[PDB]
Amino acid sequence: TYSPQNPTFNQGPVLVNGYPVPPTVQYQPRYVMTSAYPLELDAFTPNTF
Amino acid sequence: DLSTQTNEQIYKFLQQVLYPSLLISIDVPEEGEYSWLLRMIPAAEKIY
Amino acid sequence: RTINRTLSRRISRNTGSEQVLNLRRLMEKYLEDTRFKDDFIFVAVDPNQYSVPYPTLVVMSGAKVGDHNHFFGYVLPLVAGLAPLPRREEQGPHGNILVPRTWVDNLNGTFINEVMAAMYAAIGGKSNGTARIAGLAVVTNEITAESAHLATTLLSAADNAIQTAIEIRLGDKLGLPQFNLGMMASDQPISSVQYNTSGMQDSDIVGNPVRSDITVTISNRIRQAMSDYDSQQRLVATTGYIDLTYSPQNPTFNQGPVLVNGYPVPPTVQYQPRYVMTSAYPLELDAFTPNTFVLGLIGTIATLNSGMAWAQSLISNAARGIGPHNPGALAMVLDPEVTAPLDLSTQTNEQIYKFLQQVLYPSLLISIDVPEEGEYSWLLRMIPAAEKIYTGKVEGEVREISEGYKALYRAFDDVTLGCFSKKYQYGLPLVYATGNRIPLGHYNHQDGHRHDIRDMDDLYMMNITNPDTVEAWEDSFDRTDMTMSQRVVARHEIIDRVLSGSWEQTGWAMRYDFDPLALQALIEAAADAGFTIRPENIQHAVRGNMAARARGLGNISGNIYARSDGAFNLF
Amino acid sequence: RTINRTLSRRISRNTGSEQVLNLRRLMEKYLEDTRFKDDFIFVAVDPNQYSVPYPTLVVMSGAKVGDHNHFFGYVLPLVAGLAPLPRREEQGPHGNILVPRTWVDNLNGTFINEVMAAMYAAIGGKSNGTARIAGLAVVTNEITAESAHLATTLLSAADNAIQTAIEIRLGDKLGLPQFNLGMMASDQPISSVQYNTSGMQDSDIVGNPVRSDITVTISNRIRQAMSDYDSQQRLVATTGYIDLTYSPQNPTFNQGPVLVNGYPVPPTVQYQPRYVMTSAYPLELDAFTPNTFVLGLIGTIATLNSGMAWAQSLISNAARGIGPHNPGALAMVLDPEVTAPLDLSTQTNEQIYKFLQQVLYPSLLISIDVPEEGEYSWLLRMIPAAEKIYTGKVEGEVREISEGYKALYRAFDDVTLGCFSKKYQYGLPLVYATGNRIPLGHYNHQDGHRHDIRDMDDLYMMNITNPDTVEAWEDSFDRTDMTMSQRVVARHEIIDRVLSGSWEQTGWAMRYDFDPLALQALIEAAADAGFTIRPENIQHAVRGNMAARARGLGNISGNIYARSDGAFNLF
Fold first, then answer.
1. Are B26 and A32 in contact (CB under 8 A)?
2. In Å, how far are C185, D383, D454, D476 from D367, measured between CA atoms?
3. Chain B: nearest CA to D570, how far in angstroms?
4. Distance from CA of residue C8 to its chain's centroid?
5. Do A17 and D256 touch (CB under 8 A)?
6. Helices D516-528 & D290-304, crossing angle to 10 degrees?
7. Cα–Cα distance for residue pair D39/D26, rounded to 1 Å
8. CB D312 within 8 A of CB D318
9. Is the minimum CB–CB distance between D183 and chain B shorter than 8 Å?
């Protein structure tokens, strides 16, 4: 996901886990879940999810 | 082409352009085998 | 364990199968028409009533001497459709490590005790006879109602194992002979070799691939006396491949030069060729016993040394060009500056031979892989048993000698009609242990076939990966301050990284090698018993006079020439 | 052993000496004129009648409480003129190794039992009192009839040790006070530091050199009220040097940046400075106890952090140019291509400081070397005793705490009049063990003096040897999968190769380091008790306005601004 950091707005640096990042970083990784299913369980309920 | 680089070199290359965190998302189908189960996620979006 | 009973559903997608019922039905159906209906007993052992990890079937048969009955069984665990074993945490010098396991790791003493109890319940009791286990093999492929061929093959293997056990244990009392070289006295043995490395490989009884770079066939030649017809009868076959072992020579230790066959070698030579045997099986012989295995070993050794015929494997591999089995990767060893493997597909055979002579020792090491379970593991377990020569038992005068050593020595002596005893001293080594545990399995090749996992060797690492991986692989094969589990972990990690985790493991094997002096004595003893062999496929005028060099007079005796013509003692 | 008696000769070149007779005579001669003639007892133990390895002398003195007598002894083995110990073969993971030994390795429990028996025979019997050992020191230099000064110094050391033991054991019943910071309430403490690295070094009681790169002196300032005279009174001194520890930062593990004092550091920083204390001794104080040691520690910590005063040692060393202590060797660490240490003798101080800021962490680690025997080993053994916080003894509710930890905590709390207890939690760590055994000894320097063997450190290896040796040295200092004997062997081998075998070893030492949180709490508690110090020797206008930056208004609250203005639900 495209997500540039704006330093020119007189804001503080971007901190991830309390640590600053290099000025060239501009993309945010994202994990997308596509499916979930049982293997040896007979029943699949919201708690199993 | 990065097929001739070692793993640490590729990791260092990636550290210059990507944020070191992950966003968790999910695709909810409008109909399917488990749509009845997964429709609970959209239902919780409106708190009040 | 009982989650399904608690949270239950009416219709289930997983129901399981009945492999033991399917296999037993096929075997009985095959036997119902022959005359051996009553010679076999089938015993079903399942975890619901015995403490066993997998469903198994036992094939039993008996023999009677005097008034006593003796029973022998062949065990077949069926594991298709089960989850693979997890990793086990062990204790190391630094900390904890996780070690891979496979199916055979669960077959301990408890399993043997349970199988024996089931067998005794089958025959009637302890008073009805005696029972012993004759073999074991794991079946990893599914058994359906359309698997008649596999059932017939498994039944044949069980029958051969049981019959051989009966012979070895009670031949003298039952008058059963065994193979020896005297039965080949009135005919002419021959041999042949095939080098093939592209395409499908050999397969085992279950159906899994086996590495077969080199194949040797031993036959018998026949001619009709009056009608002049020609024919041959094929006896036994053997498969294997060629590997490399790092072994630098140290001149700086003020030692003498390394001599091979009494000849010095160039200073740049640092790798030792090694031959690894992967399988051996009969062709038209009905029975396969340890003596037949000795015959196969003799034939293979004679063929592979016929004019350096083993180097033809590397020369043939060099013709494909750049690839995982290219011998041109040794150019990087020879010259450090060279960083890319060399292409030798446009060189003549003698040029390639000359190139190889600068980096390899001119001798061969004979080794063998012994599986922990399989079709012929019962036969091949005799090699590990002979590794320990002496039981440390107290001796009145001369130390006691173990039983496995005795069995192997007796086989060698009986095949050659008693000449081995006169050639080799009783008590000298026959077999050495390397200490390496090798995995067995398969993976998907880019040509559409399944290939043996043993394709990953030193040459593969030289051609495919970087030098750090090569160093790590060789180190796990050679270092003496590493335990077995540590070596297993190192090799497993490298294979998993190279293949991206897309492979399947089926078993384990251990590697042993023979003593060269014992092998030379065996060849000489076989010759002294009247046995000769004629290889038929070995390939490779020259100007000059060769006899003139040997007739030169160098030096003469020196007696033919006329001979020419205070402080210390002070006190 | 009795070869000389068998093959004997009338005149012998080796006759030996009587060190115990010489030393005892000198001590008694010194005491014969004072008023303490009857306060001391001298006991001679020799191998001819007791099971001891060396000739030893014991100095004893007593104290009486009630009707009971208590006796304390100081032990002095004399080893000049004997052959050095041989190497001992040990067991390793791979095989056998030969480990060096020195004089102290022979002083085991049997030696202690024999010394105690001799002491009991001296005083009359078990019914005449009780005996305890108060200290131990090995004398490696010869004693002749012209060694009065050495005898007097040894007697003084023994007296101080015995008196301190009596105080610690029986002060409450005997009414004996101990030092604390309340006695410095009406005066002004001061401190001074000297950086010297060329020439002679400091010496111990026997006369062997001690590494003294940094020396700190703690004094007291006095002014006469009416006459206005000025004077100072010197109390205690401390010596030590600066070392380096390899400690790379790993950014690739997806962790946060390394923060020192809440500030990030440049990516090229990879070495951690370390301060090692080598000795501490009194100057004009007659008594030296654990409380006095605490005062010395407080003074040293306060002085070394006064405006980065410790980096002045490296800056001063950089002025000599190319040599074994040149900090310019770190240029090879910074840039790989650079292969020769840099010369920094023509740079200004700020330039050198800027160069150092690119490779070093801006903090200091406090460590100490504890000798296994020596003049003050009885005092300094309390540091190792506090390393184990908890005895694993079963607890009704709260786990039991050990006695050594209690003693160290009590000393810290008593010196500061009970403020340390309010600042630091009871049961938190105070001391860590590194696990490294360090040799003690000396060698011949090219300037004509004997130098401490502790001159061989990381910087020496960087400047003198090749990078492989540097890697081996650091690895023996840091790897956790190496036993103690293996590290000792590795370091011994490197030193022997560098010095060509021309050196002498005298003893052993172990290295410990303090907890930084405990040290900060100790400094704060000392301040809260009314104690202040004024360093007098610390060195290091600037344009600009520094207060203007702090008065800038950055941001304001956002509340001051006016605010603007089917499938899922199907069933």
1. yes
2. 86, 11, 15, 18
3. 11
4. 50
5. yes
6. 100
7. 16
8. no
9. no
Q: D378-396 burial by CB neighbour count: b if 16+ within 10 A, else e?
A: bbbebbeebbeeeeeeeee
Q: Which residues contact D192 (CB under 8 A, 6 or more apart)?
A: D216, D217, D219, D535, D536, D537
The amino acid at D69 = N
Chain D within 8 Å of A20 (Cβ-Cβ)?
yes
- Asked if C31 contacts C37 with a C-beta cutoff of 8 angstroms, the reply is yes
3-state helix, strand, coil in chain A (%, to 5): 0, 20, 80
| A16, A36, A46 ranked by CB distance to B20: nearest | A16
Question: HSE-up of C67 (CA within 13 Å, CB side)?
Answer: 1
Query: Whose CA is closest to D531, among D164, D218, D176?
Result: D218
Cα-based distances in Å from C58 to C23, C138, C304, D83, D569: 11, 12, 40, 75, 60
- Are D567 and B8 an interchain contact pair (Cβ–Cβ within 8 Å)? no
Binding partners of D (≥3 Cβ pairs within 8 A): A, B, C
Residue C375: how many other CB atoms lie within 10 Å: 22
CB contact (8 A) between residue D252 and residue B20 = no
Task: Name every chain D residue with its beta carbon within 8 A of the beta carbon of A25.
Answer: none
Q: Copy the structure tokens of residue D262.
A: 């809440």
- Contacting residues of C for A43, CB less than 8 Å apart: 7-9
Tell whether D567 lies on the interface with B, counting CB pairs under 8 A.
yes
What is the resolution in angstroms?
A: 4.0
- Report which of C220, C208, C325, C327 is spatially closest to residue C278, judged by C-alpha positions: C208
D263 near B CB under 8 A? no
DSSP D462-516: HHHS-HHHHHHHHHHHH-SSS-HHHHHHHHHHHHHHHHTT--EEEEEEEEEEE-H
Strand partners, B17: none
Per DSSP, the three-state class of C182 is: helix
- B30 shares contact with chain D (CB less than 8 Å): yes
Q: What are phi and psi of D217, to 5 degrees?
A: -120, 130
Q: Is D416 exposed, middle or buried (0-12, 13-18, 19+ CB in 10 A)?
A: buried
Contact D534, D189 (CB under 8 A): yes
Pair C359, C499: CB distance under 8 Å: no
The amino acid at residue C154 is L
Spatial CA neighbour of C160 closest among C35, C297, C281, C21: C281
C290-304 helix and C403-415 helix, angle to the nearest 10 degrees: 70
- Amino acid at the residue D308: M
Partners of residue D254 in chain B, C-beta under 8 Å: 20
What DSSP string describes C256-296? PPPEETTEE--TT--EEEEEEEEEEEESS-S---HHHHHHH
Tokens of D398: 């709260």
**Which residues on A lie below 8 Å from B17 (Cβ)?**
24-27
Question: d(Cα C70, Cα C173) in Å, to the nearest integer?
Answer: 13
CA distance linking residue C512 with residue D262, whole number of Å: 61
CB atoms within 10 A of CB A38: 13
Q: Which two tokens stand for residue D62?
A: 């007593």
| B41 min Cα distance to partner chain A (Å) | 11
Spatial contact of D54 and D79, defined as CB atoms under 8 Å apart: yes
Task: Give me D281's structure tokens.
Answer: 């001794």
**Residues in contact with B15: Cβ distance below 8 Å, sequence separation at least 6, in sequence order:** A22, D251, D252
> Would you say D179 and D415 are in contact if contact means Cβ atoms under 8 Å apart?
yes
DSSP lists the bridge partners of residue D260 as: D263
d(CA C396, CA C406): 20
Per DSSP, D450 falls in state: E
Measured between beta carbons, which residues in chain B are less than 8 angstroms from residue D567? 30-31, 35, 39
